[PDB]
Design a protein around this ligand. Structure first.
Ligand SMILES: Cc1cccc(C)c1-n1c(=O)c2cc(C(=O)C3=C(O)CCCC3=O)ccc2n(C)c1=O
Ligand SMILES: Cc1cccc(C)c1-n1c(=O)c2cc(C(=O)C3=C(O)CCCC3=O)ccc2n(C)c1=O
Ligand SMILES: [Co+2]
Ligand SMILES: [Co+2]
Lengths: 367, 373
């Protein structure tokens, strides 16, 4: 609302996971979500440090990284490293997977200048992780701590980061997931988290057992909701298994929630992702009156064929469903979302947060 | 014909293979789809286990077990008897260090024996390094793990009856995926010196050197029935393909796993259909000059349609006396060029076989001269 970003922010760029084996994790996400193998940076391409692989589906970019043996790149230094990412560390990445397990490490958002966004953020209370380093004079990258061991990454451009080999040969799955809608993190105290994060970003606040506040960018396209537990708290269950604060889930905007689900739900037993139980028929019997004008009777019955939730806000309506936890622990999962309405462009598409984020379903599921 | 049948204890057959992953969920989902096994048992938080996330995949009699450690803080007050783990030999630090050094690799090789209690006492009494004393689980199954090569251990499983470990809740319906794989053929490991490796393994178990290499020194071991095959390889400098393993895996470790199949032409099309969508990449197929002379040496075994299908799938073919061998190798399963998986189907060398000769047709040694080293 106030448009008070301390620097220019374009939109969501990529989301990087820190696995123990980036091959088996990425091969499952490519088959469970339908993403194309775009770029890669492992021992095949000549990277002795980590095995980074890129999955893309529209604008969404999932990066998976697992460190190799430190003895391979033992005779190297920071200015003379082999890793395509200069902010990487073996011991720090091993501690991320030994403590937090499979989780999102870096939430990257493209800015017009990474060195500027870093210098502005640190000068306003941020905690720097890695200073801005220009990658082959083509991409500037900086990282500042978000919550816990999650970092906020700034990327500058003058398809991906240098040092990545494009994979366009026979060695393209697409189910509708186009971009990242929002990224929700869980913190022990929502107070200092909003004071810290929004302190150096200038992000305004967009507007049981949890208290959530959504941070938004200038155009409200970068949405970073933050959650705190309410003391059994389902959010506290996250912090106990994650061993500290971290990301709860990722909202993946789909161009068509109906077919995107029918491409994933038919594959949850062959290596895909599992979903939460479907709401009782009374929810869809009650759904025909709350959003009977947005969704037709033929489209509402299709929501029950896949167990999809619907919420409504101020001139906005969104459809949503949640996957089961991705890793072993009940920590990080994935939300698939499609918003209806709020379309208003001068010359196409809509704004951000069309329909809220589904807080109306917290009571509609309890009937 | 050349085996003394000098088993130190009654060895029945293969059981399972335990993978110590960092996240056993994603690895098991890839193997379930890439290889085509079937999710048949679980032991995690959904069943009451707070120590490790174990997930079982079963394709015929082959059983792949994927076990990842949970947070050490979840089991802060559990002593040794009061552990909620279905596998008591599991340990947090032993698994956090196995994946930190060896990465994604095989932790244990399970072999079904008559009495793991006796198999443990006979083994340790012959120079074996014990990794886990026998533990009677649920008064039904007894397991014992003895150190093999490196950090991989030899696991014994015994039953008081003539499905899996107790505590593993079944999966009622997991998709019944089955691409053709039936059982485990042989398991190979890499060591710096082959000498002290054969004297050790054959010393505490009584296995015999099997008898029915550019870049390695092979020596297969087999039991009395010869259904349990465990080859070992050592590098020959002047870079050897094993020195690459010993440098990436950081020491010894299980090389690959050969998986039997009732039809290698059936399993390969399913895995190659998926090699680009979450499956397993394979090694580059031999040139067309490999399948022309193939019609002359093994043309009296396969048909013109089957040999052309071998070229379509790029299947390596080698033949010895009394049985031919069809094999093909996948690219490394993990991030590092360490562990991969072999698909094999032997023909001929048969008997009654109610409900095939053990390891007949060789192991692909002729393909070290034919295709390349
Ligand atoms: C999936 C699950 C598992 C165990 C316990 C519970 C409460 C849930 N759970 C959700 O987490 C959930 C989350 C959102 C959601 O999008 C969300 C918020 O509502 C707050 C703002 C930030 C944000 O992203 C909406 C609906 C939800 N519903 C309906 C639901 O049941
Ligand atoms: C696939 C590849 C990539 C890069 C380097 C190389 C040597 C290879 N490679 C093999 O690894 C390979 C392995 C076996 C095999 O299964 C095996 C042996 O290694 C000996 C001991 C017992 C045993 O079963 C057979 C044939 C092979 N051939 C022909 C081959 O080329
Ligand atoms: Co959400
Ligand atoms: Co083999």
């Amino acid at each position: 609302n106030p448009k008070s970003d301390k620097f220019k922010v374009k939109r969501f760029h990529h989301i990087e996971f820190w696995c123990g084996d980036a091959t088996n994790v990425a091969r499952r996400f490519s088959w469970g979500l339908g993403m194309r193998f775009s770029a890669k940076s492992d021992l095949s391409t000549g990277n002795m440090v980590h095995a980074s692989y890129l999955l893309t589906s529209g604008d969404l970019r999932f990066l998976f990284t697992a460190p190799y043996s430190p003895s391979l790149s033992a005779g190297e230094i920071k200015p003379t490293t082999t890793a395509s990412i200069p902010s990487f560390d073996h011991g720090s990445c091993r501690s991320f997977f030994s403590s937090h397990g499979l989780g999102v490490r870096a939430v990257a958002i493209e800015v017009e200048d990474a060195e500027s966004a870093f210098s502005i953020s640190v000068a306003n209370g941020a905690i720097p992780s890695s200073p801005p380093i220009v990658l082959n004079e083509a991409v500037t990258i900086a990282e500042v701590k978000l919550y816990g061991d999650v970092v906020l990454r700034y990327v500058s451009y003058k398809e991906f980061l240098p040092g990545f080999e494009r994979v366009e040969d026979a060695s393209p799955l697409d189910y509708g997931i186009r971009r990242l809608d929002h990224a929700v993190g869980n913190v022990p105290e929502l107070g200092p988290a909003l004071t810290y994060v929004a302190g150096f970003t200038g992000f305004h606040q967009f507007a049981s057992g949890l208290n959530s506040a959504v941070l938004a960018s200038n155009d409200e396209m970068v949405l970073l909701p933050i959650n705190e537990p309410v003391h059994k708290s389902q959010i506290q269950t996250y912090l106990e298994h994650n061993e500290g604060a971290g990301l709860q889930h990722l909202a993946l905007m789909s161009e068509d929630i109906f077919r995107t689900l029918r491409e994933m739900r038919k594959r949850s037993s062959i290596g895909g992702f599992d979903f939460m139980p479907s709401p009782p028929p009374t929810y869809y019997q009650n759904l025909k009156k709350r959003v009977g004008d947005v969704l037709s009777d033929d489209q509402i019955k299709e929501c029950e064929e896949l167990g999809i939730l619907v919420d409504r806000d101020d001139q906005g309506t969104l459809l949503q469903i949640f996957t089961k936890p991705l890793g072993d622990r009940p920590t990080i999962f994935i939300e698939i979302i499609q918003r209806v309405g709020c379309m208003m462009k001068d010359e196409a598409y809509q704004s951000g947060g069309c329909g809220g984020f589904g807080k109306g379903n917290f009571s509609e599921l309890f009937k």
